[PDB]
Write a protein that binds this ligand. Structure first.
Ligand code: PRO
Ligand code: PRO
Ligand SMILES: [Mn+2]
Ligand SMILES: [Mn+2]
Ligand SMILES: [Mn+2]
Ligand SMILES: [Mn+2]
Ligand SMILES: [O-]
Lengths: 477, 478
C-alpha cells in the first residue's frame, strides 16, 4: 500500500499503520458495554492558523488524536469511523479555483482515498448529509482532560451536528488507551525518530566549543534533523542549558531563549528531539563544555548514569513506575553520600524525601505522537502526593508495548537546597561545606527512550560513559 | 541604555527604539482632537500557547503591536502608556516559586524595568488597582481589522476593566499609521534582517545541487539565519519551489511541504526571509537548478529583472503604488512579446488585463514587524477591482519612510493560461506554438525590500544578473 515518505534516506511509513489503529479502536469500542450498535466515531482535524490577527501563517501540525487515527497532513479535514464495520470516511475541504494559483494542485477525492487508504472520501460541506444517510444511533466525539496540561480536548463540531445524538464521554478513555500501546508499525517510526535525534546529538557534541551561544547548537540539531531526517518539526522546544542553566528543567523557552555563552568549565545539558510525521523523540545528553569532566562533574554524571542503567535493567512487565522513580532517588542519595555532599542513613534520607531536592521532576513519561504522551493517569490511577513523585506523568504498572522516557537527573537548585537546609529533618543529612562547592554547578540529566517487552528495548544510541563522551568531543573516530 | 542582543555578530537593538515608538504614538494621540485628556493606552501582550489540548508548548512570538510599543519577549504581559505624559508601565506575571525549577530565574520587577527601560513595572494581577489609582479618563484599547487576513485584532481585557470607560476605536488607525513609517532605528534592524537573509540566500545558491529535496535548502536557510543571525523565527514559512512548483505562489505549506526533488533543467524560486527580534525580511531569488540559464530561462528571468529595476527607478514620493503595478504589467507584456510568446499590440494586451495572467499577485506590500505589514488600506483607500490589482496589499501613494517589497514575477499557470485561451478578448494574443514550450516552466519572481526616501534605498543584496547568479552558484567570493 501507499507510504508517507520525504525521500532520500527518510523512513517510509505505511498508511496501513493508521488503518491498524482504526481497527484497534473499533475492537476496543465493541467490547465497551455502553457503546450502542450503529455508533460512529467523529473526529475533527486541525485547522490552519495565523499569528494573532495577522495573515502570517503558522506551520500546520496535525492534531494528535486525528493523526493517530488517519495520518492526514492537510488542514481542515474531518474523519469518521463506523464502529460496527470499521469503515473509514475522510472529509476534505472543497477548495476554490484560486487555490491552484496560491497553494497548489487541487487534488480529487479519489487522490485522497488512494493517498490515505481510507474507504471513502467526501467533502467537508457534505458531512451532515453523509452522516444522516448512514442512520447512526449516536456520534462518539472526543472530549477529555489531558493530565499533563490540564486542558480539555474539545470535541468535533460541524453544521447540523445538533440533529444527531452525541456522546462525548465514551471515546476519550478508549482511544487514549489504544495510544498507550504501540503497534510494531508505530515502533518502527519511533526507532527512526530516535535514530535521527541520536545522530543529531552526536553532531552537536562534536560541534560544541567554548564561546558558542547555546542556540547555535539548537540550530545545528534542528538542521540535522530536518535536512537528513525530514523532521520539519521538533517534538518540543529545544532545551540547550549550559552552566547554571542546566539546572533549569524546561530552559530554552521565550523567557530564557538559549542565549547564554558557553564558558570553559561549564556542564552542558542538551534536551532535544526531532519529530517525524508527528511521531516524537526525546533525548538528553549531558557533558562538559570543554570536553573533559572534572572530578566533581564525573562524580555527579556517573551517579545519574548509574540510576539510568539501574532503572532500565529493572524495567519489566508488572513493575510499578513509582518504584523505579524511588529506585533512582535511592541511587542518587547513595552517590551523593559517597561524594560527601550527604551524610547519614540513606534509609532515613528516603523517608525524608531528600531525593526530590536533587530530582524534583518525574523519572520519565509515556512518549508517542506527543512527547508527553496520553494515558498516564486513567481513571483508577492516582497521582502520588509526595515530593518528586507528584511530578510523575504516570503511576501505572509497566506492560509490553509501552514507550517510556528514562530520564533521571541530579541538579543543584538553590531554592530547593535552601528549603532543605532550613528543615531540621533534612538539614542534618546535608554537608554545607561540601554542598557549597556545587552551588551553580547546574545539573546532569541522562535521557533515553525505551520500549517495554519481556524487558526493554533501548531506542536511543549516543555516547554515555565518561570515556565515550570525552573521546567523541575530542574529535575521535 | 540597554540593548537586545544575541551575541556573536548579531545586531544590538537599543530598547530606545521602542521608547521612540511610544513617544511617536503619544505625539500622534495628543494631536488627535477626539482623545480625552488623561487617556491611557492599554495593550495586552501575547500569552504562551500549546498544541491543541497537549502540554507541548509552542515557541512564543510576541504580538506585533505590543512588540512595536514595548519590545517585550516574555508571555503574559500588559503594557500601558499615559498619553499626556508618555509614562510607560509594563505589567509582568507574578510567577510561582516552582517557576525557578522548571522555567528559569524569577526576575524582579526592577530587573524588567532596567531591561526594557520603562518608567514603572507592576504585577499583572494588580493592573486594575494600579490604573484605578491613576484615575484615567478613558482607556484606549486596540481593535481593528487586518486588511490582509480580514481578522479582527482583539482588544485588551483584564479583571475589573468594566469599571473603566473604554474606547476601542481611536487607537488602531493611529498606531497602524505610526507602524507604516519606520524610524531610523527600525531601519537599522530591517537592514540587518535583510543582510542576514541575503547572506543565507547566497549560501543556498552555492549549495543547491540537482537531486536535492527542496526542504534541504529550506533547512540550510533557516540554520544560517539562526546560527549566524540569531533569527530563531522565519518571517513566514519558506517557499522553496522547484520546477512547476515555482508557479505556486505560496508553495511550501503543510499541504505542499517543499518535498519535490530538484531536477536538471528546473528553475528554482526560493522565497525566504528570516525574522530578528520580531522584525521581518522577505527575499525571493530565482535561478536555474543546474547553475546555467537556458535561453528561455534567461529570457523570462531578464524580463522580470527589467520590471523590477524599472519600478525601483520610478519609485518616488507621490507615486501611486497601483501605477507601479501597471508599469510592471506593461514591461512583462512587452518582453513576452519580444520572446514570441505573445503577439500584437501591447496597448491592447494591457486593456485586456493580460498582464494578470502572468502575474496574478500584487507587485508588493508594506513590510515591518509583520511580513505583510499593517496599514495598506486605511479608511478612504479602496481596493481596485481588477485582475492582479485586486491582490495588491496597498493602494496608497508612496511617502518617505515606508518599507515595501518590490516583487514582480512571471509564471505559467495552466488554469489562467487556459482561461485566456478560452477568452476571445485575450486568446488572440497568445502564440500556442511558442507558449507550449513554456508549459511546466514554473515561474520567476525577483523580490527586494526597499525603503522610500526621495527615491528608494535597496535593503537586499543578492546576485541578480544572469552573470552574477551563475557566478554565485559557481562558488565565487563577494
Ligand atoms: O517534563 C518532564 O517530565 C521532563 C523532566 C525534565 C524535562 N522534561
Ligand atoms: O503574498 C504576496 O503578496 C506575495 C506574492 C508572492 C508571494 N508573496
Ligand atoms: Mn526532554
Ligand atoms: Mn522528557
Ligand atoms: Mn516573499
Ligand atoms: Mn513578499
Ligand atoms: O526530557
Amino acid at each position: 500500500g501507499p507510504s508517507f515518505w520525504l525521500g532520500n534516506e527518510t523512513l517510509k511509513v505505511p498508511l496501513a499503520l493508521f488503518a491498524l489503529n482504526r481497527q484497534r479502536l473499533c475492537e476496543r469500542l465493541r467490547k465497551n458495554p455502553a457503546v450502542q450498535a450503529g455508533s460512529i466515531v467523529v473526529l475533527q482535524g486541525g485547522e490552519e492558523t495565523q499569528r494573532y490577527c495577522t495573515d502570517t501563517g503558522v506551520l500546520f501540525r496535525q492534531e494528535s488524536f486525528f493523526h493517530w487515527a488517519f495520518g492526514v497532513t492537510e488542514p481542515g479535514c474531518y474523519g469518521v469511523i463506523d464502529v460496527d464495520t470499521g469503515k473509514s470516511t475522510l472529509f476534505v475541504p472543497r477548495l476554490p479555483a484560486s487555490h491552484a494559483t496560491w497553494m497548489g494542485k487541487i487534488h480529487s477525492k479519489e487522490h485522497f482515498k488512494e493517498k490515505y487508504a481510507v474507504d471513502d472520501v467526501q467533502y467537508v460541506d457534505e458531512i451532515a448529509s453523509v452522516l444522516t444517510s448512514q442512520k447512526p444511533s449516536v456520534l462518539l466525539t472526543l472530549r477529555g482532560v489531558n493530565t499533563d496540561s490540564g486542558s480539555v480536548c474539545r470535541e468535533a463540531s460541524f453544521d447540523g451536528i445538533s440533529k444527531f445524538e452525541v456522546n462525548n464521554t465514551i471515546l476519550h478513555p478508549e482511544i487514549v488507551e489504544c495510544r498507550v500501546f504501540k503497534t510494531d508499525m508505530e515502533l518502527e517510526v519511533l526507532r527512526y525518530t530516535n535514530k535521527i535525534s541520536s545522530e543529531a546529538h552526536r553532531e552537536v557534541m562534536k560541534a560544541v566549543k567554548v564561546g558558542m551561544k547555546e542556540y547555535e547548537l539548537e540550530s545545528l540539531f534542528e538542521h540535522y534533523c530536518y535536512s537528513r531526517g525530514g523532521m520539519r518539526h521538533s517534538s518540543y522546544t529545544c532545551i540547550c542549558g549550559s552552566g547554571e542553566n542546566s539546572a533549569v528543567l524546561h530552559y530554552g523557552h521565550a523567557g530564557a531563549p538559549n542565549d547564554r555563552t558557553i564558558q570553559n568549565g561549564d556542564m552542558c545539558l542538551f534536551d532535544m528531539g526531532g519529530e517525524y510525521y508527528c511521531f516524537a523523540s526525546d533525548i538528553t545528553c549531558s557533558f562538559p563544555a570543554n570536553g573533559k569532566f572534572t572530578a566533581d562533574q564525573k562524580a555527579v554524571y556517573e551517579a545519574v548514569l548509574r540510576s539510568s542503567r539501574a532503572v532500565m535493567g529493572a524495567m519489566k512487565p508488572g513493575v510499578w513506575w513509582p518504584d523505579m522513580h524511588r529506585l533512582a532517588d535511592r541511587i542518587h542519595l547513595e552517590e551523593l553520600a559517597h561524594m560527601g555532599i550527604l551524610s547519614g542513613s540513606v534509609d532515613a534520607m528516603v523517608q525524608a524525601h531528600l531525593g526530590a531536592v536533587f530530582m524534583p521532576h518525574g523519572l520519565g513519561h509515556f512518549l508517542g505522537i506527543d512527547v508527553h504522551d496520553v494515558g498516564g493517569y486513567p481513571e483508577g490511577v492516582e497521582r502520588i502526593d509526595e515530593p518528586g513523585l507528584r511530578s510523575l506523568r504516570t503511576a501505572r504498572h509497566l506492560q509490553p508495548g509501552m514507550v517510556l522516557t528514562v530520564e533521571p537527573g541530579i541538579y543543584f537548585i538553590d531554592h530547593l537546597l535552601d528549603e532543605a537546609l532550613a528543615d531540621p529533618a533534612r538539614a542534618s543529612f546535608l554537608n554545607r561545606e561540601v554542598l557549597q562547592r556545587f552551588r551553580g554547578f547546574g545539573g546532569v540529566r541522562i535521557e533515553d527512550v525505551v520500549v517495554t517487552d519481556s524487558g526493554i528495548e533501548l531506542l536511543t544510541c549516543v555516547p554515555r560513559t565518561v570515556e565515550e563522551i570525552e573521546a567523541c568531543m575530542a574529535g575521535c573516530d
